[PDB]
Amino acid sequence: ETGATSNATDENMIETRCVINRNGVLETTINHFFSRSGLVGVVNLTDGGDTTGYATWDIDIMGFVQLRRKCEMFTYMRFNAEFTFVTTTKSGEARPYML
Amino acid sequence: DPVEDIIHRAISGATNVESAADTTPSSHRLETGRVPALQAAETGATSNATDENMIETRCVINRNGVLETTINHFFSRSGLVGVVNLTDGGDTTGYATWDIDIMGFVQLRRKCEMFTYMRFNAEFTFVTTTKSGEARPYMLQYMYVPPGAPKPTGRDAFQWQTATNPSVFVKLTDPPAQVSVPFMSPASAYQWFYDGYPTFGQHPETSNTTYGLCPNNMMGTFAVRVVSREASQLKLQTRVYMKLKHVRAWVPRPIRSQPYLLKNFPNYDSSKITNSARDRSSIKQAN
Amino acid sequence: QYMYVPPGAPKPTGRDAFQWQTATNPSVFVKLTDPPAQVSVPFMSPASA
Amino acid sequence: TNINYYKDSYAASATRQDFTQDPKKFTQPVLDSIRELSAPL
Amino acid sequence: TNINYYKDSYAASATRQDFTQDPKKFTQPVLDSIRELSAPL
Amino acid sequence: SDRVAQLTVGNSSITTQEAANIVLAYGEWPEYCPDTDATAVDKPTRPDVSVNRFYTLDSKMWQENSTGWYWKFPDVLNKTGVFGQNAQFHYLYRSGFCLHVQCNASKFHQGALLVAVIPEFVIAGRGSNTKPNEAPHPGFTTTFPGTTGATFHDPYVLDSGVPLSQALIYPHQWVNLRTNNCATVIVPYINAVPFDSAINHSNFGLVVVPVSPLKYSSGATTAIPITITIAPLNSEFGGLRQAVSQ
Amino acid sequence: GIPAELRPGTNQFLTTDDDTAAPILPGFTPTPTIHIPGEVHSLLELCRVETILEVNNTTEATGLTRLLIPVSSQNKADELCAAFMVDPGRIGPWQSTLVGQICRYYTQWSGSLKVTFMFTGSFMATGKMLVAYSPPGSAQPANRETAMLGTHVIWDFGLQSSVSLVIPWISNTHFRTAKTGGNYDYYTAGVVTLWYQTNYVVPPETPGEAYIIAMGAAQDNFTLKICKDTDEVTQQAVLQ
Amino acid sequence: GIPAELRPGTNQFLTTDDDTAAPILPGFTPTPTIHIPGEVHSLLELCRVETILEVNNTTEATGLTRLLIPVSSQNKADELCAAFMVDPGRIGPWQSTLVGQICRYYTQWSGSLKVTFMFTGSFMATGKMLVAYSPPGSAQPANRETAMLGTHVIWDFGLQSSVSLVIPWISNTHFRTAKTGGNYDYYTAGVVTLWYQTNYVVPPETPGEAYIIAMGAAQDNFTLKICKDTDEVTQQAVLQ
Amino acid sequence: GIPAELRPGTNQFLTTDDDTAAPILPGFTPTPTIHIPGEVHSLLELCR
Amino acid sequence: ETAMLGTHVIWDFGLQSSVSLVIPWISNTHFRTAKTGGNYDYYTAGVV
Ligand SMILES: CCCCCCCCCCCCC/C=C/[C@H](O)[C@H](N)CO
Ligand SMILES: CCCCCCCCCCCCC/C=C/[C@H](O)[C@H](N)CO
């Protein structure tokens, strides 16, 4: 009821041996947890259809799920970012056009 | 002190040897009760008889290098652990999946199976091409799927967003893709032979297929697609090579004598036993 | 694929042969449009010259 | 004098070579030392 | 011993790792210290 | 002096006239698990004299055509003794074994047995089928034969598809009827993990294979039994729970 | 220029690769930071915090009754109140905990877990329960004369209505992969059962049926590794 | 940026090249190591260990009789018991040894070899054998008055049933390529023959036919180089 | 990564260029040398 | 297989034809009355 979690440890509850633990805690830091890249948006450009000619994407990283669900387990986040643009044809092929 | 009985090494040591052993000059011996030649093979110890004791030798200072035989240079050579076939045009399909096993086929398997326990890092290299061998400027995605991660159910699946699962985007015309892998086992070493069952319970004597399998060797799945919204029409084949580095090996054992029938199991066919040797004409004639 | 086959190693018997797995024999994979492939070789004679 | 371009040590190269041998454990795993010039039994 | 190729510090890498924990603020956010071996109330 | 020898552990003792030395596998003694290597946090139990001691199994009669036998050690002792009861009530197990094989025979008999301790010994299925679903698998009772042991079908490959000629790369000892009447090997605990379940996993097997066959003359004693004695050594147990024998 | 040779791994995009990229805003200083309380560094802090654990599932209980498990006066002595398997990465009770959701982003886990039971019954009700943890090797015990053979605590309703069952780390391997089922039952942690030690006694004119809330968390030896992508959420198409 | 010029050897994958590759798991610490006895460092340890050597091959002996060679009472004196060529990389007896299998991953070899013979006959049997090594230049000797001209040992059955014939390193070149046949007979090491020195004597009512087990290994001057891929195993198609 | 710019003379094979190439045999020590009389260093000896 | 569970010695015919089995003192009481049978089976030492 006090709102504090149980402070009961191993050593107090039952008989334990002497264990010197070498397991690393590093991989669980928030700074290694978001170090993994994810897909925040995908924009479709057709230059030939009618007039058109350009594509516009308003920047929102809530666009879809996996990365959204991670970032929403904290209320406040301050950070830098690194964007990577993977572009291809609808057929997957690559052609020497400049973008 | 109130009760007494509650009141309560190894053998050898390792010598750093940079070069092969030398030879020291010896001469004839005639005397009794000194006999380096007579050994007892029953004791389980190999003959300690040397050159210098058996016959007369000269003084030879040997410069030949011993380095190339270390286990860490023996596995430094890359080999083909798997090959996965991807056809994006056939029916629906769209993706290929390969469960990671380096027992897939022979040459590298036969090397790693001369030790029971191996701890090491790895380096994977992905050589991808068309069935025709030609290269074309298509982009591919290689996603690694650790145990328990959901596998891709299609080319458009959300599985490919890869907010967590590490991926490799590389075009098909570019040089091969290469990555380093750590030692990921939940145990302290990989083990290529596990005698036992992964679970408790009953073990039928009809189909034992649970037997022999070690869960600690299951690293999950490697998936591959080609990135486009529309399905490309092509056939494609991805060969996977791995260097094996920072290696340690324990309790060596004999090599495989018999051809491998199965991937995960050491089965052989008992009628065809090969008698590893070559047949001969009687004895007492050598070739 | 350029595979070097030291004396006594089994030669490839076909394009699909298992000889090409190269767990031991050193190989060179290079695309045909790339710059030439170049490697260093030591002195491999069993003699001194 | 090798070099690592990443902060993850497992990405490195063959690191440093080493020469170590104790065949004594495989060759002579016996609890009574056998002098090589004398009768084993 | 990392390196930055630009004069804008935000372009750098993961910089230096760190190990810091004070779960005490989430685990035990209480104003009267509870000795772990004694009755809470 | 070196021929004669006597072991002792627990309340059991063994004496040998004609023995040839002793093999200590991989140059290391059995030990308790060090604090650094330990993982499970419970305090393990160390019974000592009740567990560590020599256990003798039933004897195998060795005949002119005999093909050899094998055993799995954290198996044979699971249903016998106090060692077997601790093994059924505990989830975790560690120990080394001191092993002794015994075959008598007259100076008029001849033959040789190869005694070998071969870790992680995995028997294999015998058949030509390459399809994994229809491929034969070697039974339950062939894999863990228990106290009674199992016999090889084709000892030349050791049922493992591996040449017996190279079995000397394992801690091993010959018992040669003209030289010694017994073979002795001490095995430290080896595995990829500090503790492991006794009933599921078999650390190592033992293989007694009659390399040179058994030969004698008419009028000599025909029956030549082979007996094995094993001492679980420096044992540990953990993870107490209700008894599970299978 | 300086001679150089390109290697395999050129022109590849590895999503986890740690590199530098060209900055798009030269000479940019960000908005100054201020003190915000509650800064987290590692996810392990997040893990040690106790969270509501669902035991009652079935097809019934609708939304919030899933959190509660009933205790009531039993006619036959030595009866089983509830049970569940303690693997946090397995589908089941631990999916409602926040330790169970954070261990689904990771392949393996190692450490001691603790389970807390708080009794919501009336002040005038008394009783004693036996909560036991049985390491693997068998299905859940049939009777508590078997269940006492494992690690257990005998807990007495009273002032200070909560008790803590710690379940020590007991495994052959240093880590346990969170995936279960199939041949991955090799990694099962065990089963924790909750038994009536004596009975549930209540005076007259007082409710005869009560609830125990269950709770779960991790301890300071608990760690994770091999970060993966979780299977708990799916997306059928792009989210407009 | 820094000027640079690419060279031949760009964009090539050399399987033996020693480089670094981008790590896929940032901030990964592996499972801690523990002490496992039997760690091996070089393959030479593995080589020095004696292994069963097959001499009897023929079309007969079936599986395990191939390891044994017979000795029996001979009517005619000075008779040849057995012989074989001592090249370990050549098809023959040495394929069953573990030194002969490990030298097939390597092109060349240099060093002294030792061969051990253990006599499995009865305690009451006696005899003397002559085991000789003849360096190249001729086929195997026809009679042992020729075979005595080489390196040999006269061995006497007794307590301590094993003897060791060392075969010194005797070659013009520092190394010998393991390939044989054709013009590679230049590298042949020699032939080791096993002769009756006197006879095989046995008392009455005792078996008159016995077996010598043969053995092989390497010594501390033995080395290898130029690691290749072995020819002992083949694969017809992918292994499912 | 480190910024760089390629120059003319890229992807060219100059037969006399003095460079290093990737070794095909890691950890290889060659056969030890012995004394052979008649070692020549420059061709001018040969010329005189 | 039952008899091995007690104190035992494995003895090998050879030179030195004699062996000695010691049977340690193992009893709840400090002494054992020599009378046996009836309720004095309480004092039985054991079977070899
Ligand atoms: C050359 C293109 C470079 C694009 C640079 C834009 C970077 C944008 C800053 C990082 C993203 C800020 C976080 C996004 C906020 C949320 O997604 C939505 N605004 C709120 O729904
Ligand atoms: C982007 C793809 C990266 C893939 C990384 C996966 C690395 C896997 C770890 C190294 C391989 C572990 C050894 C394999 C074990 C055996 O082959 C089987 N599991 C047992 O039959």
Numbering used by the authors:
A (entry chain A): 51 to 149
B (entry chain A): 2 to 9, 18 to 296
C (entry chain A): 150 to 198
D (entry chain D), E (entry chain D): 28 to 68
F (entry chain B): 10 to 255
G (entry chain C), H (entry chain C): 1 to 240
I (entry chain C): 1 to 48
J (entry chain C): 145 to 192
Show passages lifted from the paper.
Coxsackievirus A10 (CV-A10) belongs to the enterovirus genus in the Picornaviridae family. The virus is considered one of the major causative agents of hand, foot, and mouth disease (HFMD), which is highly infectious and affects millions of young children annually. In general, enteroviral capsids are composed of 60 copies of biological protomers that are arranged in a pseudo-T = 3 icosahedral symmetry. Each protomer consists of four capsid proteins, including VP1, VP2, VP3, and VP4.
In the present study, we determined the structures of CV-A10 mature virion and NEP at 2.84 and 3.12 Å, respectively, by cryo-EM single-particle analysis. The cryo-EM map of mature virion displays surface features typical for enteroviruses, including a “mesa” at five-fold symmetry axis, a “canyon” around the mesa, and a three blade “propeller” at three-fold symmetry axis. In the mature virion, most of the surface exposed hydrophilic loops, including the BC, EF, and GH loops of VP1 and the EF loop of VP2 are well resolved, whereas the densities for a few residues (including residues 1, 10–17, and 297 of VP1, residues 1–10 of VP2, and residues 1–27 and 69 of VP4) are missing. Similar to other enteroviruses, CV-A10 virion also displays the canyon feature surrounding the five-fold axis, which appears to be shallower and narrower than that in EV-A71, CV-A16, and poliovirus type 1 (PV-1). Specifically, the VP1 BC loop shows obviously distinct conformations in CV-A10 compared with those in EV-A71 and CV-A16, and the VP1 GH loop of CV-A10 does not have the typical small α-helix as in EV-A71 and CV-A16, but forms a loop, probably due to the presence of Pro213 in the VP1 GH loop of CV-A10, which may have disrupted the α-helix formation. In our CV-A10 mature virion map, density corresponding to a pocket factor can be clearly observed inside the “pocket”. According to our mature virion cryo-EM structure, the pocket factor of CV-A10 is mostly buried in the hydrophobic pocket of VP1, and its main body forms abundant hydrophobic interactions with surrounding residues, whereas its head forms hydrogen bonds with residues near the entrance and middle position of the pocket, including Ile109, Ile111, and Asn226. Our CV-A10 mature virion structure revealed the presence of a pocket factor corresponding to a fatty acid with 18 carbon atoms within the VP1 hydrophobic pocket. The major densities bridging the capsid shell and the RNA shell underneath the three-fold symmetrical axis region and pentamer were identified, and the possible residues involved in capsid interaction with RNA could be Arg43 and Arg62 of VP4, Arg18 of VP1, and to a less extent, Ser10 of VP2. In consistence with this observation, in silico docking showed that the VP1 pocket in CV-A10 could not accommodate WIN51711, pleconaril, or pirodavir due to steric hindrance imposed by some VP1 residues including Phe133, Met193, and Asn226.
